[PDB]
């Protein structure tokens, strides 16, 4: 069969008149590098589960995208992250919502699916479970970026 990957970094009011070329270039570069990582994995025969997990992990690690590092701020100036993963072969799934002390939500979600008998975990319970299973606790400010904080400030201004 044919093997293929697709990824996104969010849909919305992205527009030519508020974007600089260098910014667009950085996005093209990041999307290109991550989709390629995925292609090569698929090409080498890695599982679709591993592929989407790693692609999303890379989108989280990239500060340009609103997930993981670079998460937007709530009105409280905190970060609340959510993620889900689903395996079409077993129909097993894992999900976390409202976590603030886990570096990579997608990994936490997969942890829920594979290391618990549950599908969805939220908040501090999710965090506590993840720590029990060996995932690191991070300080809540690792996700913070000036760009996203400036967006909060501008949202408040209007």
């Amino acid at each position: 069969g044919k093997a293929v990957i697709a990824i996104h970094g969010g849909a919305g009011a992205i527009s030519r008149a508020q974007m600089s070329l260098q910014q667009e270039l950085r996005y093209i570069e990041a999307l290109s590098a991550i989709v390629e990582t995925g292609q090569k994995m698929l090409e080498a025969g890695e599982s679709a589960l591993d592929v989407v997990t790693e692609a999303v992990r890379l989108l989280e690690e990239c500060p340009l995208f609103n997930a993981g590092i670079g998460a937007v701020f709530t009105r409280d100036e905190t970060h609340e992250l959510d993620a889900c993963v689903m395996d079409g072969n077993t129909l097993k799934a894992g999900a976390v919502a409202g976590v603030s002390h886990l570096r990579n939500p997608v990994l936490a979600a997969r942890l829920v699916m594979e290391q618990s008998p549950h599908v969805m975990m939220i908040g501090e319970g999710a965090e506590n479970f993840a720590f029990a299973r060996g995932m690191e606790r991070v300080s809540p400010e690792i996700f913070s970026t000036s760009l996203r904080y400036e967006q909060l400030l501008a949202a408040r201004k209007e």
Binding site: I5, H8, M19, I34, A48, V56, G98, V106
Partner: protein, 134 residues
């Protein structure tokens, strides 16, 4: 909001979605990203989907599962399903956004009704394609 979908060489589908939420979000709000069938879904019999947009609407319309259900029960092609959900059904509920989707035959789509969607796709053994605007 970010996401990924993939079909592998063994025929398996998978999907994943991750988000930081919304700027100025009311603490405790949960959108579609972590809800199975809303922002993320996959089934070897139909499709794999990851969504991005106005969470509330994607939850109310079970966007991700709906793609699957329309193909599985309705007979719609992957393209037909994406059109109905993304261009007709979600806007009627007041929602904006898009999704990425791969079906079990290897068709891939990246519909969005917004000005743009950060995205990329590529088949194994081939050159990738990226996009920001329409």
């Amino acid at each position: 909001t970010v996401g990924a979908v993939a079909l592998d060489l063994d025929g398996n589908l998978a999907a994943a979605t991750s988000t930081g939420g919304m700027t100025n979000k009311l603490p405790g709000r949960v959108g579609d990203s972590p809800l199975v069938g809303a922002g993320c879904y996959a089934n070897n019999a139909s499709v794999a989907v990851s969504c991005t947009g106005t969470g509330e609407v994607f939850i109310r319309a079970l966007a991700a599962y709906d793609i699957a259900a329309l193909m599985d029960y309705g007979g719609l092609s992957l393209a037909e399903a994406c059109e109905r959900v993304v261009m007709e059904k979600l806007p009627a509920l007041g929602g904006s956004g898009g999704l990425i989707a791969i079906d079990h035959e290897g068709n891939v789509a990246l519909p969005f009704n917004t000005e743009g969607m950060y995205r990329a796709w590529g088949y194994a053994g081939d050159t990738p394609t990226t996009g920001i605007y329409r």
